[PDB]
Amino acid sequence: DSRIGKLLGFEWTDLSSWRRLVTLLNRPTDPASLAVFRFLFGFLMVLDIPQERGLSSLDRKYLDGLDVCRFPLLDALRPLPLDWMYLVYTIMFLGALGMMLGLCYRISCVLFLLPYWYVFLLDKTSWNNHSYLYGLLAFQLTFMDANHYWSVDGLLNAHRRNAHVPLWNYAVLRGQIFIVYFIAGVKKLDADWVEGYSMEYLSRHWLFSPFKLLLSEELTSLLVVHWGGLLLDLSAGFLLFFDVSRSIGLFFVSYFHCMNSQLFSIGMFSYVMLASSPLFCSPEWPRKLVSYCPRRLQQLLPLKAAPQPSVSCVYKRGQKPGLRHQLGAAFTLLYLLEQLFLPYSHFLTQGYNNWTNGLYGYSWDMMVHSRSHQHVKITYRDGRTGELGYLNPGVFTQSRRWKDHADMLKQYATCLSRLLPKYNVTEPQIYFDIWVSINDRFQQRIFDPRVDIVQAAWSPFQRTSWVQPLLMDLSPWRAKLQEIKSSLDNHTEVVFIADFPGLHLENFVSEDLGNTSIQLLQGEVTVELVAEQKNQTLREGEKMQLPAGEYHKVYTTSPSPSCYMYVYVNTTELALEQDLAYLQELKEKVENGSETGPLPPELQPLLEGEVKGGPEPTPLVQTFLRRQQRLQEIERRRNTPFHERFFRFLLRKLYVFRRSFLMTCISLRNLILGRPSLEQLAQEVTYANLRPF
Amino acid sequence: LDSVFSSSERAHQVLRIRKRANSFLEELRHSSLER
Ligand SMILES: C/C(=C\Cc1c(C)c(O)c2ccccc2c1O)CCC[C@H](C)CCC[C@H](C)CCCC(C)C
Ligand SMILES: *[C@@H]1O[C@H](CO)[C@@H](O[C@@H]2O[C@H](CO)[C@@H](O)[C@H](O)[C@H]2NC(C)=O)[C@H](O)[C@H]1NC(C)=O
Ligand SMILES: *[C@@H]1O[C@H](CO)[C@@H](O[C@@H]2O[C@H](CO)[C@@H](O)[C@H](O)[C@H]2NC(C)=O)[C@H](O)[C@H]1NC(C)=O
Ligand SMILES: *[C@@H]1O[C@H](CO)[C@@H](O)[C@H](O)[C@H]1NC(C)=O
């Protein structure tokens, strides 16, 4: 009756006492929308297990006998052998199918939940927001009575056939989606999102073509992409709940998610959010959709009559609340409070803090920070002889996220410490030097390059002392530097560097990179050439021509950070391009009839196009033929029909699913009936990898 | 194999031309099979 009563659905007096709150949170509600969401979520996760979880690639990630450095949340966790991992994924698949079909719902939910979180916590390099969301949804749905409508348990059990469900089942999901939208929006109130730096190059996609009929590219990249996204997050959080705004909110949210699906490669996140969007609608929309159909079709679709009473609700005649109702209310309140708190819990677990806040995955800060790494050097000093050596940047690793987090760096250092003695290295001391820029800033060190990470100190609840601060004082320079980026030719390239007081950088210019120069933008540096031991002190706005093929050091000798730049052009590439262009001009002259004089013998293979019955072509001729073939391939790719691409996509996905199924079969057979001789295994592995055709 | 170790000449090369990777940290598993 009250206006608040219709707007919000509940009256204020319901919150006076615990009993009234429990009765409100356990009132009857229709089960249809929850059942549809359960079906869609189960089906999408079933499709997602062989694609993103990595069951197709599981045989080259956890291969037995290979030594790789793992990054688990807890050091205690260790992967099992490959076959048991295949069994774990089979259990996941069975649980997901059970959730989809509503068959043994609680058991299926547990079988999906526990393996999923095991995989999620086993590796920190595979964390993203849309995996955390799937984990949370699986956790929530374990307790919700979602097997009441369109479920096989209903057919096998009369009491759970089209029955009522309590109201907090919908409330928890609605709150979760609202939290996702709102926290994503508020997290996007950052200086690098409101000013157009994050996703600065996404306005070129053809989906934004109509906007370009009325707005320029720069304006389209700010008003639509950034401010539009932020406003859509906050407004889509609020609007869908209210009755009046549901249609416009649904339209904008659906357009937003379809554009996200096409623009990015996030995966199944867009479809999951689309499936969750109807959940804010009335709890009985599928029933009225079913009713408005022919009777013959209604003979196959689920029941349409009013639901029967359930014992998971409190009815007002009354009925004193039991125990599960109180637990449901407490679970709802505590879970939503924890969900609000966790994204902002970064001041307690300070070990994981960096330039960004906390580990990625549970902050809802999607597509806000972009990083470009320029150089990574790993140096080791032997603990017996004193020799100094250099390792490859990414050895014994499968991801590139260790370059930005202190904990992963410490784990990598310990892994290298335990592995290197297999290669005649005594107790080593490992030093790291990583150059990274976030949102197009100066390249700067992230970690102190004088600290042995093997013996350094790290605890989750105390700040790490060997992470360099982000120099945010140089923020406005991002304008001017960009101008210098646009003043160059098609050959010249520029790299910007900002360095701390006391430190130095030692660099080696390759023989190819002739005509390399160094200019100083701010501060005071001294550049040392070591071939003749000569150092020159550069003032602001002075340029030097560095040697090619030697080592040079740049030292910072000012109390404040110094900013400089390297400008270089590749001489070998330019010379090859010019010679190839001359050759192409001669070829064209021959083709059109000009150059009546005899062709050189080396040119005869070029016209023939095949090396048969003659001397082997020079490397330049081979490069020309390769370039021509690549250009022809690209041209053929461009002039390609859509239907062929669609058929190829279907075939590729078929191959992925086939490989997953066959390899899982091999693993299960090995577990149960033992391992055959090696020849049969080789034959089977050859059979599985066969392309479908 | 002997790909664990590298050389001083090829380690101290800040200026090496390469491609650009946005690395949004939200797009699937990035290069996937490559690395
Ligand atoms: C990349 C963007 C957001 C990140 C993101 C993603 C990928 C999600 O999966 C989310 C899911 C749920 C909640 C938040 C999510 C999220 O934050 C902006 C997307 C680019 C751009 C804004 C799309 C353009 C379409 C809108 C409708 C334009 C309206 C502009 C009017 C002026 C017409
Ligand atoms: C060239 O200039 C640099 C700039 O400092 C000189 O470096 C210092 O060199 C001394 C002697 O090796 C070291 O003890 C200091 O620690 C260095 N300073 C810093 C900040 O690291 C260098 O010696 C000069 N070279 C020559 C050949 O004169
Ligand atoms: C500079 O430009 C040259 C142009 O060739 C690049 O070179 C090739 O370099 C790769 C290794 O990176 C060789 O395998 C190829 O054979 C070279 N191609 C030739 C000679 O045609 C080179 O990588 C660029 N960068 C640097 C630092 O030199
Ligand atoms: C030396 O290192 C090589 C490379 O592994 C190998 O011969 C062995 O590990 C070591 N042998 C001796 C005698 O040091």
Side-chain angles (χ1 to χ4, degrees):
Chain A
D1 300 331
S2 306
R3 297 182 178 181
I4 283 70
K6 195 180 291 303
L7 290 174
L8 292 80
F10 75 110
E11 292 281 16
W12 301 103
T13 184
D14 302 329
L15 304 177
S16 74
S17 178
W18 186 237
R19 182 171 185 167
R20 303 185 190 177
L21 180 57
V22 169
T23 298
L24 172 55
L25 283 168
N26 295 263
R27 65 194 250 195
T29 309
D30 293 68
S33 178
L34 191 64
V36 172
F37 168 67
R38 175 189 59 79
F39 180 81
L40 292 171
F41 182 70
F43 184 61
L44 292 173
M45 295 307 295
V46 161
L47 290 179
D48 189 23
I49 285 161
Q51 289 185 27
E52 193 178 350
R53 297 286 84 80
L55 183 57
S56 59
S57 183
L58 193 73
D59 64 328
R60 58 182 65 179
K61 176 168 177 63
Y62 295 94
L63 179 57
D64 301 330
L66 185 65
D67 49 355
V68 198
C69 301
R70 306 290 173 186
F71 303 136
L73 214 174
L74 281 73
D75 303 334
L77 285 178
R78 301 185 296 277
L80 303 176
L82 182 57
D83 296 314
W84 300 93
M85 286 284 187
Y86 274 111
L87 180 59
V88 167
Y89 280 104
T90 300
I91 290 164
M92 282 177 65
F93 192 89
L94 263 53
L97 277 179
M99 275 173 62
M100 189 183 70
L101 299 170
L103 182 57
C104 298
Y105 178 68
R106 264 52 173 269
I107 296 164
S108 305
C109 282
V110 171
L111 290 173
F112 183 84
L113 182 69
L114 273 56
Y116 184 92
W117 282 100
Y118 182 77
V119 173
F120 190 80
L121 298 182
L122 226 181
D123 200 332
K124 293 187 287 187
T125 50
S126 62
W127 283 21
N128 42 61
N129 296 278
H130 62 264
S131 299
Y132 185 67
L133 188 66
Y134 303 162
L136 291 186
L137 291 177
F139 181 73
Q140 292 172 21
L141 268 63
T142 299
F143 298 111
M144 299 184 180
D145 303 68
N147 65 335
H148 286 196
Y149 189 82
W150 202 22
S151 63
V152 177
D153 282 354
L155 298 175
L156 275 58
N157 187 21
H159 292 282
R160 294 178 175 277
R161 184 152 166 73
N162 196 315
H164 278 137
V165 302
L167 179 56
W168 67 261
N169 289 328
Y170 298 100
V172 172
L173 294 159
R174 290 176 186 184
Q176 185 66 37
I177 300 300
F178 183 87
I179 288 160
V180 168
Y181 281 112
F182 192 70
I183 301 300
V186 76
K187 285 283 188 176
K188 283 178 176 63
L189 286 167
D190 193 357
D192 293 2
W193 182 266
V194 306
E195 296 183 11
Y197 291 116
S198 318
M199 295 154 39
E200 190 174 3
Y201 301 130
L202 194 63
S203 185
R204 294 178 180 180
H205 201 269
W206 63 270
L207 294 173
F208 290 102
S209 50
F211 299 94
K212 298 186 185 303
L213 297 174
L214 295 308
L215 291 172
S216 62
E217 192 180 352
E218 60 186 358
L219 267 62
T220 302
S221 166
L222 193 67
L223 300 175
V224 175
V225 179
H226 294 64
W227 296 358
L230 167 54
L231 295 172
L232 196 148
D233 283 8
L234 305 179
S235 62
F238 284 106
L239 289 166
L240 286 172
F241 172 55
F242 294 108
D243 291 326
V244 186
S245 304
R246 192 173 293 108
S247 57
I248 301 300
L250 278 171
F251 176 76
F252 290 158
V253 170
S254 294
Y255 186 68
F256 172 88
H257 283 310
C258 291
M259 258 186 164
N260 281 13
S261 174
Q262 292 294 351
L263 290 175
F264 296 91
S265 59
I266 63 188
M268 298 289 181
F269 189 17
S270 175
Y271 305 110
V272 169
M273 298 300 289
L274 282 173
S276 77
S277 275
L279 201 59
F280 291 86
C281 307
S282 59
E284 57 181 0
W285 67 264
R287 189 170 280 97
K288 63 181 188 178
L289 263 66
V290 165
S291 297
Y292 303 154
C293 286
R295 193 75 176 185
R296 301 177 185 179
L297 295 179
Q298 288 180 3
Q299 294 177 9
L300 304 176
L301 301 177
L303 298 175
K304 54 175 184 300
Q308 57 165 4
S310 180
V311 76
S312 60
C313 301
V314 185
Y315 306 89
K316 301 181 183 181
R317 297 179 64 180
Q319 182 176 357
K320 200 254 284 296
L323 188 64
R324 64 183 302 177
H325 307 98
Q326 300 182 4
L327 294 178
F331 172 77
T332 303
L333 301 177
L334 271 61
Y335 180 82
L336 289 178
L337 262 66
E338 179 263 19
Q339 279 290 279
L340 288 174
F341 174 75
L342 223 183
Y344 305 105
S345 81
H346 297 303
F347 68 95
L348 299 175
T349 60
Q350 280 185 354
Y352 302 89
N353 285 131
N354 296 118
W355 296 350
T356 195
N357 269 319
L359 289 170
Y360 190 88
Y362 59 92
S363 300
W364 309 121
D365 54 355
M366 314 186 186
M367 314 294 187
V368 188
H369 295 304
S370 300
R371 323 199 184 197
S372 182
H373 298 73
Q374 180 56 25
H375 190 217
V376 179
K377 181 174 73 175
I378 299 165
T379 309
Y380 76 93
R381 177 171 271 94
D382 186 68
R384 185 179 62 181
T385 314
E387 297 184 4
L388 202 66
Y390 303 85
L391 306 182
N392 282 332
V395 72
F396 302 143
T397 325
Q398 304 181 15
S399 178
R400 59 181 64 179
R401 280 193 183 185
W402 60 267
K403 302 177 177 183
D404 305 328
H405 301 83
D407 55 319
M408 296 171 67
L409 199 73
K410 186 70 174 63
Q411 292 188 37
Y412 189 53
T414 310
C415 177
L416 288 177
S417 177
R418 78 173 199 176
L419 289 175
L420 284 170
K422 192 163 62 176
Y423 302 85
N424 287 321
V425 175
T426 62
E427 296 179 357
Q429 304 168 6
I430 307 180
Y431 310 92
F432 294 82
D433 184 10
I434 296 161
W435 296 83
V436 47
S437 71
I438 296 181
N439 293 327
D440 191 4
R441 294 174 199 272
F442 289 90
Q443 298 279 9
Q444 49 164 342
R445 291 175 168 89
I446 172 159
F447 293 105
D448 193 357
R450 299 168 292 176
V451 180
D452 183 14
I453 307 303
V454 173
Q455 296 289 357
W458 173 89
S459 57
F461 305 109
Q462 303 182 7
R463 197 185 300 178
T464 60
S465 55
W466 42 271
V467 179
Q468 298 291 357
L470 206 182
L471 296 173
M472 299 197 74
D473 303 2
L474 299 320
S475 297
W477 282 89
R478 299 186 285 175
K480 300 175 68 58
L481 303 176
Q482 197 276 351
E483 190 178 358
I484 296 166
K485 191 69 63 52
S486 62
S487 178
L488 306 170
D489 310 2
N490 299 22
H491 325 291
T492 307
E493 295 186 12
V494 60
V495 175
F496 304 113
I497 296 293
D499 200 357
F500 284 104
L503 282 62
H504 73 87
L505 178 63
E506 184 179 11
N507 196 17
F508 178 85
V509 196
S510 58
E511 299 180 357
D512 304 328
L513 271 51
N515 184 85
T516 296
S517 60
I518 179 166
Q519 178 172 352
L520 176 55
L521 300 179
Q522 173 170 333
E524 189 181 2
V525 295
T526 71
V527 185
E528 171 172 357
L529 305 179
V530 305
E532 48 267 23
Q533 292 281 3
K534 187 176 72 174
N535 44 18
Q536 296 179 358
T537 71
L538 279 50
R539 250 65 169 279
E540 296 184 358
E542 280 189 1
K543 183 167 68 175
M544 183 173 176
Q545 191 73 358
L546 294 166
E550 303 178 0
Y551 297 79
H552 73 272
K553 294 180 179 180
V554 296
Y555 303 82
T556 302
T557 66
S558 59
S560 64
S562 60
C563 301
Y564 44 90
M565 61 185 285
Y566 285 101
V567 172
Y568 59 94
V569 56
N570 195 325
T571 300
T572 295
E573 186 175 0
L574 193 65
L576 168 56
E577 188 176 0
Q578 286 183 5
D579 295 358
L580 198 155
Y582 176 83
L583 185 60
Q584 180 172 356
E585 185 174 1
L586 266 62
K587 180 175 93 297
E588 290 176 2
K589 285 176 176 175
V590 169
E591 284 176 2
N592 58 42
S594 60
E595 191 67 11
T596 57
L599 76 175
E602 301 295 345
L603 199 138
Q604 288 174 19
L606 293 170
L607 301 180
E608 290 178 2
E610 297 181 358
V611 182
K612 301 180 181 180
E616 299 180 0
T618 59
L620 207 168
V621 169
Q622 297 179 5
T623 302
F624 180 84
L625 294 174
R626 187 181 292 92
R627 186 175 179 180
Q628 185 176 356
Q629 186 175 356
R630 190 179 181 82
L631 182 60
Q632 289 176 9
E633 187 175 0
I634 293 164
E635 186 176 0
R636 187 177 176 181
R637 184 177 175 182
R638 290 173 185 180
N639 303 328
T640 310
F642 176 79
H643 52 76
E644 282 182 4
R645 295 177 66 269
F646 187 84
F647 194 77
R648 287 177 184 181
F649 179 87
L650 266 295
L651 260 60
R652 174 159 48 261
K653 297 293 183 190
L654 179 62
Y655 164 71
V656 171
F657 281 102
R658 177 175 151 93
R659 193 180 188 280
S660 301
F661 176 55
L662 270 294
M663 295 294 286
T664 296
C665 286
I666 294 163
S667 159
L668 294 165
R669 184 211 62 178
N670 296 14
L671 290 172
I672 298 167
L673 285 92
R675 191 166 292 185
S677 301
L678 291 306
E679 190 274 350
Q680 202 179 4
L681 269 167
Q683 182 64 11
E684 287 184 345
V685 169
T686 298
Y687 170 75
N689 289 326
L690 179 57
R691 220 75 181 174
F693 284 109
Chain B
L1 180 60
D2 199 354
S3 302
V4 180
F5 306 102
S6 179
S7 62
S8 174
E9 300 183 0
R10 295 186 296 277
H12 296 144
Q13 288 198 33
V14 182
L15 279 57
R16 189 191 289 91
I17 299 168
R18 67 253 297 176
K19 307 298 184 297
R20 204 271 168 83
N22 52 24
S23 303
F24 278 101
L25 306 179
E26 190 59 22
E27 296 182 3
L28 220 299
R29 56 183 169 281
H30 297 267
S31 74
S32 74
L33 56 77
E34 182 61 20
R35 178 154 174 272

